[PDB]
Amino acid sequence: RFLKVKNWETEVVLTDTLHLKSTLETGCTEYICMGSIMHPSPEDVATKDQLFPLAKEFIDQYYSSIKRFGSKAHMERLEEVNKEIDTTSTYQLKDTELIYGAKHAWRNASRCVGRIQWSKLQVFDARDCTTAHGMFNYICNHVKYATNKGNLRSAITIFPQRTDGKHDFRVWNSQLIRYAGYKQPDGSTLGDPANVQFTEICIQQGWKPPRGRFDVLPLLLQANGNDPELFQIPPELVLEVPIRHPKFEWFKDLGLKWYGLPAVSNMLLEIGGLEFSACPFSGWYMGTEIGVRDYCDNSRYNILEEVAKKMNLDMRKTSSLWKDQALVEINIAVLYSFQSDKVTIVDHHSATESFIKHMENEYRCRGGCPADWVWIVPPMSGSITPVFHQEMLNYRLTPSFEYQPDPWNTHVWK
Amino acid sequence: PRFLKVKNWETEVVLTDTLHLKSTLETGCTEYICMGSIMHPEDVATKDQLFPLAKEFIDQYYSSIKRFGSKAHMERLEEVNKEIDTTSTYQLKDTELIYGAKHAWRNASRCVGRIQWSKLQVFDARDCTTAHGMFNYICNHVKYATNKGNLRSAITIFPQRTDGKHDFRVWNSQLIRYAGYKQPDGSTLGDPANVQFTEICIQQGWKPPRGRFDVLPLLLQANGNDPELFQIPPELVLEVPIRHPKFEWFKDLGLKWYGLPAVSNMLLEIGGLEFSACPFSGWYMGTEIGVRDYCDNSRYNILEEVAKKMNLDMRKTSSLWKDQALVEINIAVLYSFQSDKVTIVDHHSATESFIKHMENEYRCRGGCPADWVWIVPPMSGSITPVFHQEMLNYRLTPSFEYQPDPWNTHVWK
Ligand code: HEM
Ligand code: HEM
Ligand SMILES: COc1cc(N)nc(CCc2cc(CCN(C)C)cc(F)c2F)c1
Ligand SMILES: COc1cc(N)nc(CCc2cc(CCN(C)C)cc(F)c2F)c1
Ligand SMILES: C[C@H](O)[C@H](O)[C@H]1CNc2nc(N)[nH]c(=O)c2N1
Ligand SMILES: C[C@H](O)[C@H](O)[C@H]1CNc2nc(N)[nH]c(=O)c2N1
Ligand SMILES: [Zn+2]
């Protein structure tokens, strides 16, 4: 009813009433908490009986947000939706409703630390698309608009909603821009180990790999349930940063670069019981996503030993903390490099500070802010960011972004 | 569903949990809201509430010694059943006290160091009756546990709660802490987290040396009477000066810390009995000192001072000057303890050990409850193996619980 959270660093207490509007399973029970489990646990289509309540609840909340609850427009819209569901088994969102739904799914993303920007989101309605070529064109316009010569802008492109489950639109790429990974016969991995499987799918589909360390993968686009199709993103639209270090002249000899635009394309946008299986959305990077996870995860580029080596660090025992020392210098390089090239990025201190400020405002104006602590806290120097000491309540608000099966596991080929 | 799986996203190892079917008290979560990051979710049990609690634990004990449904098991069930009728409560056999203590540590979802759980030295202090007696026990605990720097894990168990008005309580949160003194100009000398406890000790008669690292006196409460002050003999209190293996100016910071981390404010539940005074100790993980004690803004807060001596650009947060000074502080804490042959473990070794332990626990027990929010070190998170480890969290008994501060709940004499 009235739930409390405390910041153990500042002793500030906040009061959550928004949790009364939560919905689909945390996955937790009174006996087992699953707050550190990554995912939960085809035919999947909603019926008329399932869709009426979900649509109504979304429409109700839309009109309340525009200060028109109970208005004639509100009542007529419900009637229009209710009739459309009854005669067609689904309904279409108005443009205003789609923009509202997209922004609130981001606002509701428990795991996103960037949510302070949630209302400044550019929504591209691609519901008139019918083909993978159509999708490719939409996506290139997304990438170019968002990139903006390095002054990045948040954006989402929404492809037609799922109908009977058999004509989905999907982006098979997990992110719009990622580098290929080639597993070698000798066991090693050239490129990005995380993408070996998807790279092989692309090669099989006919992609000709240049077999390099930083090869931008082609897009694999699926329209209306058909076989997916390959397209090369135009290289001039793919902004990259060469990674160097302000103090270590040799850091650039590491030959490192990253792409400037993070763009999640494998998730599902649920608005009023409708499912948008293809909705690629993009923002800008927090430094540690590249500097900690992309470069230093043992199952990724894995450069700590090579960086430490160059730093002449004693790597005999772990208690020398040579990993900790090198990780910091890498993340200094990555911020310095993006900043030097006027490409938008945010370090993990600034980003966590703004999220606390965002969180407190949400409690004030909105009565709560779901947050997944496991994901909000950065993967280095955790306890010296303000969110480490912040208690957080986690629950699912709709509209929301959701995970969905990898399309290669589900598709029925022809 | 009678099985739950967990996956490690770095090594792709999957483990199957079945031990969760024996979970008990609340987690605080529901199917609608998860509290995995909330720190805390006469009044004692009636007669109906105690018998089954004691019942499960005895079964658990005898099932653990290959003797379930066997010889002594039967009439011990009857004997415990007998005693609760007369005494309202009951008493554990020595073997049972040892068993539940090691199992509360084993069951401690938030403890990364549980690979050692069966190597606990248990001090039965249930003949104690006075704070003087408590102090004697605690001194012997401290001296045993310190062991000239080769630290050994130990617990001292004092008399169990009976009615609630006669609790035994160690009022200090840990057995060894430094004091905290408010200053006329709003600032704070020493450890800020201890200002309130320090002021109680002064109000109780403690003469404060009013420096930073003044060890606090023990404030011991026996049988529910007023607590009393005792000064731990300093030759029992092992302290380590902090120097840097590179930076000569580090020792000029005047930094030191104690060797023995001993939690003294928790409650031990065994068979529905409530051991309100049960100080237990292990040995330090280095990040506890270098990251939390030294660099929390609400604690010793030395980041700004260390970065100055390292001459780091302190204007913008994107230089990561904080992250840099933090690494250095933690190199020195470990290096200092190691040089003084005082036991300490860095966050890399500790978390690798806990992954071994988790592997063992699923292998031999079918589950190892774990709190990701607490297991993950407070620095260099993702480069340790437990970042990428899915963990299920659930409450197994015997267990250590929190309890309120006694100065909020004590009707004085
Ligand atoms: C604009 C600046 C943004 C920042 C700084 C930001 C930051 C982050 C970070 C650091 C994560 C965790 C990343 C990871 O470990 O994979 C994350 C996750 C997420 N973000 Fe944001 N993000 C931004 C934009 C967006 C936008 C525009 C959307 C949606 C419209 C969004 C929705 C999400 C979602 C759903 C997740 C969870 C993904 C998952 O569970 O895999 N974010 N964000
Ligand atoms: C032997 C070496 C040990 C190591 C390296 C170790 C390590 C740790 C660490 C780092 C924490 C996190 C505490 C914090 O950050 O505030 C913790 C928590 C805890 N440990 Fe251990 N520990 C050890 C021994 C023990 C022993 C002997 C016991 C009990 C018999 C124990 C029971 C607990 C409990 C109950 C917690 C949770 C405390 C709370 O919830 O506030 N540990 N341990
Ligand atoms: C949409 O806005 C965003 C802003 C920022 N900063 N980060 C993201 C995550 C984007 C992202 C995440 C991941 C990791 C996926 N795991 C499941 C392994 C890899 C990427 F290559 C990528 F790009 C999104
Ligand atoms: C029993 O064995 C152990 C081994 C290790 N390494 N750590 C502990 C907890 C050590 C410990 C924890 C805290 C808690 C501080 N915040 C909650 C405010 C304060 C201490 F003064 C202290 F010492 C116990
Ligand atoms: C908000 C959060 O619950 C709280 O800050 C926790 C996070 N994880 C922790 N982990 C450890 N080991 N010790 C702590 O005090 C905390 N604090
Ligand atoms: C097991 C655990 O859930 C997993 O390693 C999580 C931990 N926290 C994370 N936090 C973020 N931001 N991103 C991640 O990929 C993960 N991985
Ligand atoms: Zn939970």
Task: Describe the protein in words.
The structure is a homodimer. With 414 residues, chain A is α+β, with helices and mostly antiparallel strands. Chain A folds into three domains: 16-127 and 154-164 and 268-282 and 352-376, no CATH class; 128-153 and 168-239 and 403-407, no CATH class; 240-262 and 285-350, no CATH class. Chain A has helices at residues 48-65, 72-88, 95-107, 132-147, 196-204, 287-296, 304-310, 322-340, 348-366, 373-376, 407-410; strands at residues 3-6, 13-16, 122-125, 155-158, 170-171, 181-183, 189-191, 219-222, 229-231, 240-243, 256-259, 263-264, 268-271, 274-276, 281-282, 285-286, 345-346, 400-402. Chain A has a four-stranded mixed β-sheet, with helices on both faces. A three-stranded antiparallel β-sheet of chain A has the order 5-8-9, with helices on one face. In chain A, strand 13 and strand 14 (274-276) form a beta hairpin. One 5,6,7,8-tetrahydrobiopterin sits between chains B (9, 387-390) and A (36, 38, 374-375). It is classed as oxidoreductase. The entry lists the keywords nitric oxide synthase inhibitor, heme enzyme, oxidoreductase. The assembly is dimeric. Structure of human neuronal nitric oxide synthase R354A/G357D mutant heme domain in complex with 6-(5-(2-(dimethylamino)ethyl)-2,3-difluorophenethyl)-4-methoxypyridin-2-amine.
Task: Report a brief summary of the structure.
Two copies of one chain form a homodimer. The first copy, chain A, is α+β, with helices and mostly antiparallel strands. Helix content of chain A is 33%, strand content 14%.
